[PDB]
Amino acid sequence: NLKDKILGVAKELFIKNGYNATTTGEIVKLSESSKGNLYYHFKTKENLFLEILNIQESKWQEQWKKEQIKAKTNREKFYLYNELSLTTEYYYPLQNAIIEFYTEYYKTNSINEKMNKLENKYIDAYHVIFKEGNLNGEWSINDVNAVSKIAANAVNGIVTFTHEQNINERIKLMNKFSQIFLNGLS
Amino acid sequence: NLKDKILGVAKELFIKNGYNATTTGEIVKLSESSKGNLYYHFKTKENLFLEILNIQESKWQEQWKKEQIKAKTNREKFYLYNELSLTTEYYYPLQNAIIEFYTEYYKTNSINEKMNKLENKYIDAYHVIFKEGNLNGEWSINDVNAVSKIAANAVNGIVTFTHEQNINERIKLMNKFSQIFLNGLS
Numbered sequence A, B: 001n002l003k004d005k006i007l008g009v010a011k012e013l014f015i016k017n018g019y020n021a022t023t024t025g026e027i028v029k030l031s032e033s034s035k036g037n038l039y040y041h042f043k044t045k046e047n048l049f050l051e052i053l054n055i056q057e058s059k060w061q062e063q064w065k066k067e068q069i070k071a072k073t074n075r076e077k078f079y080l081y082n083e084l085s086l087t088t089e090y091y092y093p094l095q096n097a098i099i100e101f102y103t104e105y106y107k108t109n110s111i112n113e114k115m116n117k118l119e120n121k122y123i124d125a126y127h128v129i130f131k132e133g134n135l136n137g138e139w140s141i142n143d144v145n146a147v148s149k150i151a152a153n154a155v156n157g158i159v160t161f162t163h164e165q166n167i168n169e170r171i172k173l174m175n176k177f178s179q180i181f182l183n184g185l186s
């Protein structure tokens, strides 16, 4: 509970004032915990944030599980997951805190350790889509891990570096990418 | 050097840390100057940054022009451009500071007359490659603009969101991307 509260309040603070401006001091006092209890559950701001991040990935996955019901075939899952990545991320309040966090502990394989099991999870969604695509004969992929990392990162890029363009155009471009790319597997 | 000597410090600081962790003061301090020398061609912080981006972009485009000769067919110009994007020391090492820069300075109306100029040079390489390929018959592209923007960002995605792993796994992934993308076009 005190741990659940630290997480809840911290998430709001990072959302309101970003990663850098938020202090464990603010988190401790507003969550009504202490520096000791905080230190025992998370050790560091970095770690607390990674934990919030894991919780968010779980939420995403549950969202994805209910959402893909709208996409029968794996080909459709791929179109929908990318469109979903773009539209949701546009109004995801933690995106700014995340950007800050990455640039922060990038030259530290420490606060970039669990950062792996995390990104790996993002990519798994693609892995499932492509593995099943293979079994369902929708396509034939040499090695899924490679194609999954590529799809995962090409999509982050279209989502991230487009920010400067009408949302309707963005979706149209992403769908075009989904189309061209799936066409490079046949 | 007055003007052309600050940008060098600011670049280092912008790349080393973020667009936020680098402040007007830290520059001048490690640059030894007046916190006002910025106005002739350096209006606001965003302008100093927006300028550094141009220098670096052009530096990258310069190199590209000199190395794209190892590529015979345009189909090859596409792979080489993407492979080189992973290895350059120009502009791409700044994509990070650029991301966090859009999570702030993107409301004013300079980020549409100054910032739009730079994005053109960013998708131009792909425009030339995709047009000359059309003219040459290597493929038939519906709208070179869509495919160009889609490609530039995808690639930037693979370069920027994997900047923490074996550079060879990198090259591998990028080449597999180029293969699939082009196989999706033609």
Ligand SMILES: Cc1cc(N)c2ccccc2[n+]1CCCCCCCCCC[n+]1c(C)cc(N)c2ccccc21
Pocket: A053, A056, A057, A058, A059, A060, A084, A085, A088, A089, A092, A098, A099, A102, A103, A118, A119, A122, B096, B099, B160, B161, B162, B163
């Ligand atoms: C709840 C929830 C709700 C949503 N509506 C949602 C929408 C879209 C995506 C996730 C969502 N989730 C939860 C999402 C948890 C996401 C964990 C993501 C880890 C990945 C980012 C990796 N990364 C790398 C490698 C390298 C970089 N240079 C870099 C630079 C800037 C930013 C990121 C960078």
